[PDB]
Symmetry: C3
């Protein structure tokens, strides 16, 4: 097992790491829509959805994998009224990478770190 | 990295697949109590709990595994008043398949897709 | 698979086992701050955070692993205003065991079993 560290996702500040590479599989921490260059959160849910996905991608790529290697995500959201919009961004993200859609669970939680609108964790496999 | 597709669980609404088979282990998407034939959601939570579990089972069996190969579930619910009823159905389901109980997490979320009362994801292993 | 059972973590109430050992990987059930000897839930969030973590430790140890083998934690909580206290206890727990921090997701849910303030599920790997 090996820690994943990348400047292309928000840095871990505290008692977790961005990702862990087990060889056969990679786990990410839950990624929130904080911009790694600014430490700020875009207000618009479309922009948050894209940025959470970009943060996940940065970690998977730092491990030497690709978006197409992601096989499970969990998408925690604060408002299911945002779901159709989040889904559209998510679908286009995978389509743009010519990637098969992963398995997914999606639930509306009460609140997320920094009052973001979503948090996404991923599991990828090394094929 | 084989996709699992079965008509005995609801077809994928959004950008996800029902299950993925990695060879050593199978992940399902979070299953909601939607009838795969009719698209209907049963009104009583006893019926929703059974249907969510049948939907999980369909995907696991589609991968060539059994209920007894399920090693972890997460049960997301909207009302802890439903918990005893859900636990009863869940226990009977595993017992009917002569299956040891998996590990489990259970939490009450704010809301679920299609306003269902529960969503269940699973991980199964192939020995 | 092998079931993990220890009297050092609370006994299963519902239809679940404490842990499952797959050889390369161990999964725990979501651990809540119930005292394994008395059944009591401590009132204070610092004490709940410590107890949940000890319950995770008991199961990972029963599998022949240790805290430093944990690679992912999901921390479901009822109030993000508790997070600073929870995080300090969590950091101290890993630091006391000279353990690299795992990946993590943290979200605020509506409610948890037995009205606890947090529930922590772990995944560990056998190196």
């Amino acid at each position: 097992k090996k820690i994943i560290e990348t400047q292309r996702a928000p840095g871990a500040i505290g008692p977790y790491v961005q990702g862990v590479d087990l060889g056969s599989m990679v786990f990410t921490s839950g990624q929130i829509p904080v911009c790694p260059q600014t430490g700020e959160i875009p207000a618009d849910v479309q922009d948050q959805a894209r940025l959470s996905l970009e943060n996940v991608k940065a970690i998977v790529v730092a491990a030497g994998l690709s978006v197409g290697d992601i096989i499970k995500m969990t998408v925690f959201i604060t408002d299911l009224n945002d779901f159709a919009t989040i889904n559209e961004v998510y679908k286009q993200f995978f389509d743009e990478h010519q990637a098969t859609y992963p398995t997914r669970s999606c639930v509306q939680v009460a609140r997320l770190p920094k009052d973001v609108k979503l948090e996404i964790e991923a599991i990828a496999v090394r094929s």
